[PDB]
Design a binder for this molecule. Structure first.
Ligand SMILES: O=C(O)c1cn(C2CC2)c2cc(N3C=CN([C@@H]4O[C@H](C(=O)O)[C@@H](O)[C@H](O)[C@H]4O)CC3)c(F)cc2c1=O
Ligand SMILES: O=C(O)c1cn(C2CC2)c2cc(N3C=CN([C@@H]4O[C@H](C(=O)O)[C@@H](O)[C@H](O)[C@H]4O)CC3)c(F)cc2c1=O
Lengths: 596, 596
């Protein structure tokens, strides 16, 4: 469960296994014929990390259904065997089977969170083959959810598909493969650090770090806290597993003004250094408080999506995206609709970007007659069990990030229907139990005629609304959109708790224009946002605006998707639309703290 | 009924009243307050001819519901009163009331066909005001048909519109206004030509023109036929109303090789000259014969649509469009979905472009539970009576055009439902009765699950199909599209009569690309057409391909319309997409005659 980010330390090797791997589509016989026991024959080459769907020009590759096999050679020095040898997969989408030589080492379900496995030393021969089989199939038991009929979420006349294909119950393309880096790392065999938990206490004008260090084996523990320049500001040797350290002259991590201490931990020979921002988060009344100050979210729902790697880790684009958000005056984004790479989370900690951290739970809705949360034995959704593992794993991975201020339990589940509360109650209970910082929890609310029956009202600390007044309703009638927006949002405002837009927007094709309200035009995108803001700016409990979307991104094919989703403020190659300049202006006049 | 195109002759003045007119939106009180009796107060200026919707930047103007008032001064020489004075409206969309000074002169229904009225000389004062009130409203009794609920033909969540608006039952924007020129012309008072009918007889290797000259008053008739250089090749004086003339050395009008004789007619002092192409049209077996040769249609459904005039007469664009069709190797187009201007028809006669001439009958479908052709007293469609007047007027206007080879009675009516045959039988009977050339008649068939019950099979001389295999069905599954296309078209091919595509295409945004099948991309548009052609090229009764559409054009707003309809081979400003070059290549290898 514990998943420390792998780093090069005095006690820990870090070997990146990324590069060109061999790649072979499964044809139904791949496991029967035990392809993982030899070199892949008649194979292609595929970059790792990357989604595989867009690297070639093959529609059958892009739209492949089922398994693929990745493989590479792994010839490592024998003196590594004096250490504990670990294979870390930061993400394999959606499910993986990992083989070393002929031998199945592990299997994983869930395409967006890391997993790892020791390599037993009796298995390492002189030359080794690493094989990773990757399953892309989605159904009523996976997160994200796939449809199990021939229905498309986006048809006039019915037809029989040529081949079976995944049918996403979500509005983004089903990019799969070895999405994020594969690495080999080592620790001391006999005594090593397995996890680190840090929390902050700011009471009585005294900043303290509380630590809890999880180990394997028997040794002595030490912890030191260091400034960015390397001055030790607190340290203790031969400590317990738990304790606290006072940080005199503590500098707080603040949105757009990050400060990270370096927390170095020793256990026997093992050494691990964890960056850590000191800050508090709390919901009080109708305010979202960061370091006891009333925060206003300004930003976006995002996607991990770039050409040609798809969902694949793209670190230059990560840095470019954060630079664009600072240029635009944003302070935050949400990990729509899955955990993002640790490289992104760590960069956000470094750059002072606030993150709403979301699970993989999109598509938990069977009625976009069996109801979504009917009993499984009557056709209800089969995701609750995996939904708990995802929450456990997500919090275990990201718990120490200062940038994470809120957990989002699901995106647009069927939360107005019968049984939703009972499905979601244990998941909220679990997230509150597991997060040592006890951060606020929410689910992101689907737009819905019976919004007063949204079970978010009974569960969430912040109400997060996805609303499309002026796009999916009142299209090209913004005066009607304004009225419909005000009627519903005055209800939410009357509940006295913080609420916010986590999505709102309008599909906009760069280069289409009209001085007169016309859907898909750059001007309409601006007018859409002006209309919504006319309402939200008058509501004192509305504490944040995150647009849909930061940038255009790939989706499944359909009559309402113009080469993907076009609601980005930026294009897929990160060029500003008219509305992106509109937001730079607007967000320049709105402070991070004390707007409402 | 008779509607000779107005021309300047030795006996006929022609005064164009086009230019800047005064323009005022009605507010409900325009007739009550009798605005037509004075200058329009607090008015704008509007170009005539033009649609009014896009000239300004006002959404309320663009989306106006109801009446508008146009007005201009009309100060004419008194010596005109020695002649018969006629006001000709080439088109006023959709309905008009015409006033001179205070006096209602005529009212017209039908937005795409000419109407005229004598100006009684006792009404002409020294200074005169011409007022034209124009109604844009559409319903179950107009052609084209408007919906009478709040439904859009292209909604996720229901909303109340801010204002009432026209709801077209058709896929093009409801452009209205004084669409085509307004002209004053004169004839002799006492004896003048009211209509001319010409037909051709090619039997026995002898080309003859049969004439029938309709007059008012008592005088002597003469007719002469002249070559383009002005050589008289047949003539007779003091003739009857009907007769025939042999044309020795006759040159036939042929597709892409036009020849027009000039037919000059005298009656008393009146003189009228009519261009006339000699050619035959006939359907025999599975062949469409022009001048006894098996024709293959290559071209488009079009729209009259340019920026900013909308539906308005744009003669430079007409010439540009014909130049592009010759550049692409097309030979034909259909007047989708209304009669086009006489200026276009006459230019097509001059340039050798073959025309399928279509009525205004689009939207004759109430179920895109009351059935379309239920009795009117039970909610059935109320268009049949006006549908006959439109057919009468269209044939009366266009009967002498060599370029017109086929009448299209309706576009995508509900022809697979009960009662369609009975609705359409009298209209086909009427068109065959009225056309002196007895040209083939068709209706354009909607795509429909029960296509074997399409009443076109019982009525039409050529089966004209609108099909979207690979767009509205099988989208991004072209291999399935090919199979579905072949299954249905082998049925049509098995009937042994000529059939053809009058629409097929794929929405394509210029500048969107992908080497791998992706809807809305330029490459997908090409692949869509390749797939269809794989099938049609193997069917010996398939005698023509007209794409949807020649060029992108404006529509109502909705989630599936990217700033209008994007199925053009060209953009709205006439720039070629990838598929336009594809068709230039393809149509360069397909002959006008003897392809199948
Ligand atoms: O053809 C139509 O009529 C509609 C089609 N679709 C589907 C997307 C094809 C609708 C979807 C609705 N929901 C689906 C996604 N929710 C968020 O919206 C973003 C976006 O759609 O841009 C996604 O990208 C985000 O991931 C997701 O969180 C919005 C609400 C809806 F309310 C109405 C319609 C239609 O009306
Ligand atoms: O959102 C969807 O799912 C669909 C939406 N629409 C409507 C246009 C919004 C459909 C329409 C269908 N008909 C409507 C128009 N016919 C011709 O098509 C051209 C075009 O549509 O390009 C028009 O411009 C031409 O004038 C017209 O003759 C095609 C058949 C259909 F069969 C399926 C759908 C959908 O499935």
């Amino acid at each position: 469960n514990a998943m420390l980010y792998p780093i090069l330390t005095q006690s820990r090797m870090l070997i990146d296994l990324s590069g060109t791997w061999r790649f072979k589509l499964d044809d139904g016989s791949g496991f029967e014929k035990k392809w993982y026991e030899k070199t892949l024959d008649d194979a292609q080459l595929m970059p790792v990390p990357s989604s595989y769907n867009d690297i070639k020009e093959s529609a059958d590759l892009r739209d492949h259904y089922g398994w693929v096999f990745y493989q590479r050679d792994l010839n490592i020095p024998a003196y590594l065997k004096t250490q504990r040898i670990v294979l870390r997969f930061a993400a394999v989408t959606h499910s993986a089977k990992v083989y070393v030589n002929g031998t199945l080492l592990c299997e994983h379900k869930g395409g967006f969170l890391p997993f790892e496995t020791e390599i037993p030393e009796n298995l390492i021969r002189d030359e080794n083959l690493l094989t990773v089989a990757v399953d892309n199939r989605i159904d009523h038991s996976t997160l994200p959810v796939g449809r199990e009929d021939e229905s498309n979420v986006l048809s006039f006349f019915p037809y029989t598909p040529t081949k079976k294909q995944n049918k996403p119950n979500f509005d983004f393309f089903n990019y799969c493969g070895i999405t994020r880096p594969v690495k080999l790392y080592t620790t001391p065999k006999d005594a090593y650090i397995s996890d680190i938990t840090l929390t902050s206490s700011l009471e009585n004008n005294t900043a303290r770090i509380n630590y809890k260090i999880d180990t394997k084996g028997s040794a002595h523990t030490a912890i030191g806290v260091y400034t960015k320049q390397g001055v030790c500001v607190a340290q203790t040797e031969n400590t317990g597993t738990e304790g606290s350290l006072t940080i005199e002259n503590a500098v707080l991590w603040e949105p757009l003004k990050p400060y990270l201490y370096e927390v170095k931990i020793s256990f026997g020979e093992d050494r691990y250094t964890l960056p850590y921002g000191i800050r508090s988060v709390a919901v009080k009344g109708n305010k979202f408080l960061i370091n006891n100050k009333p925060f206003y979210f300004k930003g976006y729902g995002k996607h991990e999506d770039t050409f040609p790697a798809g969902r694949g880790l793209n670190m230059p684009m990560n840095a470019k995206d954060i630079s664009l958000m600072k240029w635009q005056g944003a302070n935050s984004f949400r990990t729509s609709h899955y955990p993002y790479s640790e490289e992104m989370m760590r960069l956000c900690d470094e750059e002072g970007i606030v993150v709403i951290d979301e699970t993989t739970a999109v598509g938990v809705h069977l009625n976009f007659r069996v109801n979504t949360f009917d009993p499984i034995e009557q056709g209800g959704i089969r995701t609750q069990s995996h939904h708990k593992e995802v929450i456990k794993d997500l919090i275990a991975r990201d718990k120490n990030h200062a940038c994470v201020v809120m957990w989002s339990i699901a995106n647009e589940a069927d939360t107005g229907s019968k049984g939703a509360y009972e499905y979601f109650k244990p998941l909220f209970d679990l997230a509150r139990e597991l997060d040592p910082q006890k951060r606020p929890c929410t689910l992101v609310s689907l737009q819905m005629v019976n919004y007063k029956e949204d079970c978010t009202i009974k569960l969430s600390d912040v109400f997060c609304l996805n609303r499309y007044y002026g796009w999916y309703t009142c299209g090209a009638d913004l005066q009607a959109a304004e009225k419909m927006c005000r009627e519903e949002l005055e209800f939410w405002n009357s509940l006295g708790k913080p609420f916010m837009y986590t999505e709102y927007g309008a599909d906009t094709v760069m280069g289409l224009h009209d001085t007169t309200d016309s859907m898909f035009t750059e001007e309409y995108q601006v007018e859409y946002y002006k209309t919504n803001h006319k309402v939200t700016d008058t509501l004192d409990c509305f504490i944040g605006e995150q647009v849909w979307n930061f940038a255009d991104f790939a989706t499944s094919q359909g009559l309402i998707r113009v080469q993907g989703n076009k609601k980005g403020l930026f294009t897929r190659d990160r060029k500003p639309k008219l509305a992106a300049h509109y937001f730079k202006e607007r967000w320049s006049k709105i402070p991070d703290f004390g707007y409402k």
